[PDB]
Each structure stands twice: as structure tokens, then as C-alpha cells.
């Protein structure tokens, strides 16, 4: 399991 | 490596009808962003019309608009879609793909949507 | 059924500082909202500069800032360029989805 780009909200 | 997100898709349709649009991503591990789905009417402004997150478990809609679009993705393909459903004139807009980073971060060029019989 | 409202046009001279208020119809505006902002310059080109209230997006100038002001966001353009006139919207999240502000004119007087 890689990394998420953070997203606009959370 | 340079970032692009090419949209496909587009174009005049009559009232009611449906179209679904492309956005392909290159430059960026598609597989772990959140994508967006967003348009620009000409009397209007941006307006948001939904999210997906990178393994689909969630898809956000507006919920004026969540009964006529379907936010989709294949990261095999590397490719988001927009389907759209039953349009009206009010669909008339610019469409753009949106990549997530802490923003709106990363956009399409744009596919212009004409709904008009 | 949210309505999210800001100035109409705002003027300023190169060198000058800028806020743009982003309100809510529901109450307050909160770090839950987590208040976006998008720069929009002729031609449709579409840049992203805040997320989550106070996140620029990697890149961004340090001259372009997001916080709340009392129970509203704001993004500051501190020194404003030639190169900033552009129409700014902000984004504010709702549980579920983000809704878009009518946008604000940024004219840098050139």
C-alpha cells in the first residue's frame, strides 16, 4: 500500500 | 517528469441526452489521487460537481447534480470518466478534471459541453 | 441549498495587500470547511492556491495566505503583482461536497 496525495479536504 | 491531464470528450447534444467525457493522466501516480470533477458556465462560476477517491470507495456528489452525473476511474488505464445523464440547458460548460494536492492542484484543458436542440 | 458569497470586485495597486472574505449561508465559517481557493486569469487557466483553509499547494508564493477571518475565510495576497489580477473563488466543504463562491474581480492597476 503506497501513499494517497493529500486531498482538498479532509 | 511533466504533468498533464488530456481530457476527451465533449461537444454539442440535445436536451436529455448523454455523453461521457475522458481525463488521462501522465506525469503522476494516478493510482493515489483524488480526482475531481468541476465546470465553468458562462454566467456562472466554478462549480463543483464531485470527488473520487483513488480506489473508488467514495465518490462525492453535489447533491443538486448527484442524480444526473457518474464520477468513475480505471488506474490501469490511468483515466477518469464523467458520465453524464438526461442533460439540460444548464449543463452548457467547461469541464475540467482536477488532481488533489492539499488543492485543486492539477487540471485538464478543458472539454466544452453544449446542450441545446 | 448553500450559498457561498464573496465581494463582487475588489481594486488595488501593485505593491498593496488584498483580502478576499469567503462567507457561508449556514453560520460560520470553520476549519471543517476547509476553504479553498482558485485563481482563474483570461483565457480560463485555472490555478489552484489554497486547500484546507491554510494549505498552499506545493509551489504556490508564500504572498498567497489562507485563514479564517472571525467566522469567515480568507485568502491575503500580500504585495499584490501585476500578475495576480485575476478572479478568485473560494470552495467550501459541506460533509460531502465543496461549493463554489460566485468569485471576486481582482483588478491590479496597471
Known amino acids: 500500500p503506497g501513499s494517497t496525495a493529500p486531498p482538498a479536504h479532509g | 517528469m511533466e504533468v498533464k491531464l488530456l481530457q476527451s470528450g465533449g461537444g454539442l447534444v440535445q436536451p436529455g441526452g448523454s455523453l461521457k467525457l475522458s481525463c488521462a493522466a501522465s506525469?503522476?501516480?494516478?493510482?493515489?489521487?483524488?480526482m475531481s470533477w468541476v465546470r465553468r458556465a458562462p454566467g456562472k462560476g466554478l462549480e463543483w460537481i464531485g470527488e473520487?477517491?483513488?480506489?473508488?470507495?467514495?465518490?462525492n456528489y453535489a447533491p443538486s447534480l448527484k442524480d444526473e452525473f457518474i464520477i468513475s476511474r480505471d488506474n490501469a488505464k490511468n483515466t477518469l470518466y464523467l458520465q453524464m445523464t438526461k442533460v439540460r440547458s444548464d449543463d452548457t460548460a467547461l469541464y475540467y478534471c482536477?488532481?488533489?494536492?492539499?488543492?485543486?492542484?492539477?487540471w485538464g484543458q478543458g472539454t466544452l459541453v453544449t446542450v441545446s436542440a | 441549498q448553500a450559498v457561498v458569497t464573496q465581494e463582487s470586485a475588489l481594486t488595488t495597486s501593485p505593491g498593496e495587500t488584498v483580502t478576499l472574505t469567503c462567507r457561508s449561508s449556514?453560520?460560520?465559517?470553520?476549519?471543517?470547511?476547509?476553504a479553498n481557493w482558485v485563481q482563474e486569469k483570461p483565457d480560463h487557466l485555472f490555478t489552484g492556491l489554497i486547500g484546507?483553509?491554510?494549505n498552499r499547494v506545493p509551489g504556490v508564493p508564500a504572498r498567497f495566505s489562507g485563514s479564517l477571518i472571525g467566522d469567515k475565510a480568507a485568502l491575503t495576497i500580500t504585495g499584490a503583482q501585476t500578475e495576480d489580477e485575476a478572479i478568485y473563488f473560494c470552495?467550501?466543504?459541506?460533509?460531502?461536497?465543496?461549493?463554489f463562491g460566485s468569485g471576486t474581480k481582482v483588478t491590479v492597476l496597471k
Open positions: 484546507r483553509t491554510n
Open positions: 482536477v488532481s488533489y494536492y492539499e488543492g485543486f492542484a492539477y
Open positions: 473520487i477517491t483513488p480506489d473508488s470507495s467514495t465518490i
Open positions: 449556514t453560520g460560520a465559517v470553520t476549519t471543517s470547511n476547509y
Open positions: 506525469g503522476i501516480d494516478f493510482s493515489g489521487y483524488w
Open positions: 470552495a467550501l466543504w459541506y460533509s460531502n461536497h465543496f461549493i
